[PDB]
Swiss-Prot record, chain B:
The keyword Metal-binding does not apply. The chain holds residues 395 to 525 of 548 of the full protein. It is found in: Cytoplasm. Forms a cylinder of 14 subunits composed of two heptameric rings stacked back-to-back. Interacts with the co-chaperonin GroES. GO terms for cellular component: cytoplasm. ATP binds at residues 21, 85-87, 101. Keywords: ATP-binding, Chaperone, Cytoplasm, Isomerase, Nucleotide-binding. This is Chaperonin GroEL. One of its GO terms (molecular function) is unfolded protein binding. GO terms for biological process: protein refolding. Its main location: cytoplasm. Together with its co-chaperonin GroES, plays an essential role in assisting protein folding. The GroEL-GroES system forms a nano-cage that allows encapsulation of the non-native substrate proteins and provides a physical environment optimized to promote and accelerate protein folding. Belongs to the chaperonin (HSP60) family.
Length: 524, 131, 524, 524
């Protein structure tokens, strides 16, 4: 394929032009005084949304070079979403502000490599300063406050989260599903969650969630690489027979077997989902049997004389609902004998006693805590069907914000956290003049999130940002009420984790983009 | 520098001297915020003129490189002959800093600028030679 | 007239583009390793020259905005020429380097007004540092050294200047004219020089000199404004009768009378030249009669009952050769009675005795010193006619360099003087960051003259400039011999005055050009 | 006027393209196997000629930059013509060969300033080597041989020159004019020749000669600058009265008076010719009176009380034919008393006795030798009128070749002289590699004249040049007979002076053109 190549200044202006499209399309949806962005669909009515992720996903430009620019900062927005679930718009407004001001310096004639190091040092210092500004959420009374304001002043939501975290702990696994009737239910059932994701993004049948979901799914377990579908056929033959979904957990799934299940699932023949095995090496073979007795299947490793062709429903593990994120898989409520579950739990609690090394102790402890600890389930109770929808959609987000509120804490919202960090790093310097500007680029970028919220509120951003900088602490601007005051007291707050992610990721890409000299793309 | 100095002194005797830096007009602006007309359309006509009085100051600040919105907002918060010195980038009493405009010149500048704008706003038809 | 108007960034890039044409056309002729620039003429053969002034004068661009840019920096080159006579190319290479690097900062987003002040402060400090680096020429033995190397290692030239300055002094008036025979002659004749120039540039009949010259010219003196030519007619009627040139010294010459003499002189009817009266106010009326008895005319002020209509050859002042520069007029060897010359000299030496004020003492002393002191004449002796030409052309320049060598001194040549100043002002700072860059712009501009000479020599400018900066003092690069060493010892030197003029003027224009936001010109 | 400016490589290729037109149009007319070049005229029939000067003069290109190139090398051809009268085509073929090969090196990335110095050193060495190869013409028997072969094997021509040079000497003045009858006449008449030319080229009324000619002209003598024509009018009034031509000898003629005589002469009113005075300074005033008593006029210097308005035919000098070249004026046979001619001759032969200095002795000796020595006249005798023409046209050239044969001598023709020098300078080196190529460029350029003659002869130049280089001495190629042999023995020879001029001038321009970086011309 013939290629087009652009160099230097010519190449960069195409990126800036490209990112400016994606940014300006997303930055308008910042804050509560945000604007609507309308996205066209071929089938019927257009989608009107404020969700910065949905808007970002849709952007793809005509000019191949511009497209690249846009598609580069898009990779950050989606990754900020992967880290926290919040702050995708806040990431993008930051990224733009670092890039626009960064490239200005490069065009002025400054060393990009020194500019990157200036930014990253300013960021590493900002993350460090941010931890100091963070107000932790320890007790289950302050945990209830975060879940309440995140779900639009709903006290019933915050009460459920606090009760759920009081059962499984702060590290425990909490999941939300559809309710049975009129009251909110809370049970702790035998389940497990591990750190693997979907082996292909074409299993996402809940597009809004961006995840996979299978009701009463049969589960397969084998330690080996599934490449040919010949071994899968007899398993798949008996699954559409008594039609129930299927979870594939193996060392991996390669080529032919994998690329078939995708055109298989989308056509409608058999609900499938493929995931890598939990862990690697030694724990790989044990966490499989950890899943096994959690589910009630069998490990079919190609050792004793066991194959995937002679593997029936009888040899498979059953659970009553599984979810698979990009990098998160969770098996809720499996079968297996409870006495043989504690019989496997005490088979590994016995290992810690013989554990001559302190590392085994570390990785034998992680198993049981999520195996005999379990998984919580919040069954959402509402009267009408349309009310059952929204209450689920405002618990899921509220749980995500509360999760981040425990791990790193909560800082002052309204984009004041960053603008407060900005004034506290004014004395920060690099090694040479070029590095010094790199820092000042990053600090003036931290003002942009606040400035953008004020712009949507109709007020002059310059005036408001200047007033926030004059006062000290958690003093900021409420865009909803057009009133100044203490942000924490007004319930305006952002989880520290989301603001840390938003800044770090936005700097990471800007750093790569500032050091760009050559671009190679396909010919129009 | 005597010819100009005589012209400024002449106006300083006839009508006097107001606070310079375009603060005189911006001070008048805050003092006429309660002024109303006869109908809604007249009411906007006043608010147009009052927001126009901010522009001279805002323009000086723009040339000074500082953000005009920030400076004008600070001058409005304080009262009296408190303004912005663009030469020194310092705030303070304008009279004490020697920054002053003859009242006559500021009166002329406003009246004339309004007179033409008034005629131009009421324009519906234009007749000129063919290119 | 319909006008075209451009603003901001759009307006500036047209200036830069414009100055870059004039600069690149002139900077190639820098140093002794300089290149030839060929200038076309409508009549016959093209002119091949290295003279940076002749090249600058010819540049005029098509794009009206570009033309403006070019014509702006041209105004400096010519003015540097007016101050010293040397360093016009060195001015232009500096101006470019300040503008190019200056505009870069403006486009980066820095305050032009702070950038100007940064440059000017750096310059005022550089002129101050330059005076310290200067090696004065006091005794008439070191004065002979400067006149020798400036006239291409000719010892006969330097000997004449030293003898001329030993007669009239360092402040005295020295003039060169054509020789009578085979030996160089030197007489001190009764003459005077004052600070006025030609009232119109259309009298320049020696285009190479850029000045006016009249052989055995009749001279007119009247204190009043000559506007109508009616009063001039009877004077002009009797001048073409016995055809000899005419010098007009009056309060001024306005409109009708002036604009006639110009189309009068160029057609060929009557050799004229018009100049304002010497001084202003009181001394105006006395310095006229100071000229009068220096020349042998009469002051025809409209007081007692004297008119310009009844003013014959008899009422006019005679001298045997006058020269008029842009801002310099000199009457060489007039008539008048010698006893009535000292009779007028002692009429004003008597005033100093009665001088109750110390200011009179100042302005009564300036008269006599140039009135009874006189004007020197160097008659250039050669064998052949073509040798008489060049010896005159290499004394005139040698006198101009020696003049500047006395007034301010001589610094180290090869553009090292400026590059030495650059390293000594590295600690200089302004008031804000924008001013700080303004200084660094000016300091990196001081490197350009040297760098340009090295570029013409074929060697890499970066390598040579880096070597000169490492060593200290008057250590520099000889482009003629491709050897390093002490510049003073190698005879490579520049009069301090010319380097001061070259820097100051180049900064003055760059300062004005950096603060440009709007350009208004005629429509194409 | 708006200007167009081109730089570097772009600028040079336009010169090369330009010179290649002029060169290729001239190089075709080299040698005796030369081709005809046809030149168009607006009036009637076109001119068919082989004269390299006539062809060069006509070339003027459309592309302003190309025109410049062409017009630059044209300036050399005409100047070679001014030095010798021969070798204008040989100059141009050389110039091209240095430029084409020179620019090749510059484009390869070599220092033009080092390339120039390489060429000039190679040339200064070639002129030095050429003097050694020269065979002098001392005795009047070998002088007759040169005049014979230059006039197409005519022995009557060579006999006259030898007899003329035996009368006035080798330094003496020899002139040719129209004959009276059937036999060649030779008289020595009282005349003089001095080193000044026509003050304007618009007096040339013999376009083929490129000179001025006046029959029985009245002559004016005055020491001063003639600027106004008012003083000339009464002289011109009495000249058309008894219509005879007029010679103006003065210090000079400036502006109004000069520019009138030009439109005066071409219209047909009064035959005029203007020339500067002989010598400068002191001898200026004496050589005028040297002309005076040679002519029978008067010196009208503005001293005793003498003007140009009261100057009749009576006050004017008469001679019976004058010629004025570009840089040569000669007064043939004047009036004046013969006893007062020797009375002026012995007035200056008396000075040498009192001459306390040895310089006076030098410049008092030059006067008399050409004053009492005189001027020779060869009256060309033929039967028919058309034969009188050609015999004059083949004596004039034959005299020019013989003149150069005495001053510097004669080298081997056929362009072998240069190609012989080329092999003898093969060991010549410069200071650096770039200078070394500069020499090899010049040496390979010396081969071109021969190579061009062979090209016109139809034979392969490479083969012939290779054969000439193998043999040694005055062994060359005869293009007329297509035979090899001794050039001197075959009568093929070039005056050393013409070959020296052809090389030096061609190198001088190429040197200037190689060091060209910027070109400035008028906009199309
Ligand atoms: N009343 C308010 N006044 C000022 N800022 C507010 C207010 N309410 C919320 N915010 C700020 O709104 C910012 C979040 O904007 P959002 O519109 O949620 O964009 P985002 O979080 O980057 O991405 P999405 O669209 O949620 S996926 C947070 O940083 C809050 O600080
Ligand atoms: N140091 C300063 N700081 C702020 N404003 C100033 C300062 N000095 C002068 N001014 C203001 O400058 C304004 C005048 O601007 P000018 O440039 O004089 O324009 P103008 O008077 O409208 O017209 P011209 O150009 O004088 S004919 C006055 O109203 C002063 O108040
Ligand atoms: N041998 C040399 N090596 C290095 N620099 C030299 C040498 N000789 C002279 N210079 C420098 O040449 C510079 C002057 O360049 P010039 O060609 O004279 O240009 P200019 O003086 O700016 O203007 P013109 O063309 O004279 S009107 C001086 O500053 C000298 O320091
Ligand atoms: N028979 C011959 N064989 C070879 N070369 C010859 C012969 N006759 C003459 N030449 C050469 O012809 C060369 C001169 O060529 P010309 O045609 O005279 O051009 P030019 O002298 O450069 O300019 P013009 O045209 O005379 S003004 C001389 O150098 C001779 O050496
Ligand atoms: Mg959000
Ligand atoms: Mg110079
Ligand atoms: Mg010839
Ligand atoms: Tl949003
Ligand atoms: Tl199942
Ligand atoms: Tl608002
Ligand atoms: Tl500023
Ligand atoms: Tl120069
Ligand atoms: Tl006179
Ligand atoms: Tl070199
Ligand atoms: Tl020829
Ligand atoms: Tl005559
Ligand atoms: Tl042939």
């Amino acid at each position: 394929a013939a290629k087009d190549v652009k160099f230097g200044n010519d190449a960069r202006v195409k990126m800036l032009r490209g990112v400016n499209v994606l940014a300006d399309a997303v930055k308008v949806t910042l804050g509560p005084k945000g604007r609507n962005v309308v996205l066209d669909k071929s089938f019927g009515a257009p989608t009107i949304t404020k969700d910065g992720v949905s808007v970002a996903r849709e952007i793809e430009l005509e000019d191949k070079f511009e497209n690249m620019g846009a598609q580069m900062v898009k990779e950050v927005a989606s990754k900020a979403n992967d880290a926290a679930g919040d702050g995708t718009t806040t990431a993008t407004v930051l990224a733009q502000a670092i890039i626009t001001e960064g490239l200005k310096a490069v065009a002025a004639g400054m060393n990009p490599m020194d500019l990157k190091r200036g930014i990253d040092k300013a960021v590493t210092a900002a993350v460090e300063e941010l931890k100091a500004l963070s107000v932790p959420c320890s007790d289950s009374k302050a945990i209830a406050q975060v879940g309440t304001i995140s779900a639009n002043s709903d006290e019933t939501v915050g009460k459920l989260i606090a009760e759920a975290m009081d059962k499984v702990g702060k590290e425990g696994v909490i999941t939300v599903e559809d309710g049975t009737g009129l009251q909110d239910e809370l049970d702790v059932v035998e389940g497990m969650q591990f750190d693997r994701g979907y082996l292909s993004p074409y299993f996402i049948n809940k597009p809004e969630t961006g995840a996979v979901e299978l009701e009463s799914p049969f589960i397969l377990l084998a330690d080996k690489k599934i490449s040919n579908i010949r071994e899968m056929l007899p398993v798949l033959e008996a699954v559409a027979k008594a039609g129930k979904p299927l979870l594939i957990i193996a060392e991996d799934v390669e080529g032919e077997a994998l690329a078939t299940l995708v055109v298989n699932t989308m056509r409608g023949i058999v609900k499938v989902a493929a995931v890598k095995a939990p862990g690697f090496g030694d724990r790989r073979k044990a966490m499989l049997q950890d899943i096994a007795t959690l589910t009630g299947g069998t490990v079919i490793s190609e050792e004793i004389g066991m194959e995937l062709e002679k593997a029936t429903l009888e040899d498979l593990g059953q659970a009553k609902r599984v979810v698979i994120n990009k990098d998160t898989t969770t098996i809720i409520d499996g079968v297996g004998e409870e006495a043989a579950i504690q019989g496997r739990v005490a088979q590994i609690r016995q290992q810690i006693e013989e554990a001559t090394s302190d590392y085994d102790r570390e990785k034998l402890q992680e198993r049981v805590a999520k195996l005999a600890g379990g998984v919580a389930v919040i069954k959402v109770g509402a009267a009408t069907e349309v009310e059952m929808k929204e209450k689920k959609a405002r618990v899921e987000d509220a749980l995500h914000a509360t999760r981040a509120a425990v791990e790193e804490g909560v800082v002052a919202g309204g984009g004041v956290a960053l603008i407060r960090v900005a004034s506290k790093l004014a004395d920060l310097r690099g090694q040479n003049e070029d590095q010094n500007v790199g820092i000042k680029v990053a600090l003036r970028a931290m003002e942009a999130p606040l400035r953008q919220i004020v712009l949507n509120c109709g007020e002059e951003p310059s005036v408001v940002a200047n007033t926030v900088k004059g006062g000290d602490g958690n003093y900021g601007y409420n865009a909803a009420t057009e009133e100044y005051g203490n942000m924490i007291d007004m319930g305006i707050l952002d989880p520290t984790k989301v603001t840390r992610s938003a800044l770090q990721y936005a700097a990471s890409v800007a750093g790569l983009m500032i050091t760009t000299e050559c671009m190679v793309t396909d010919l129009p």
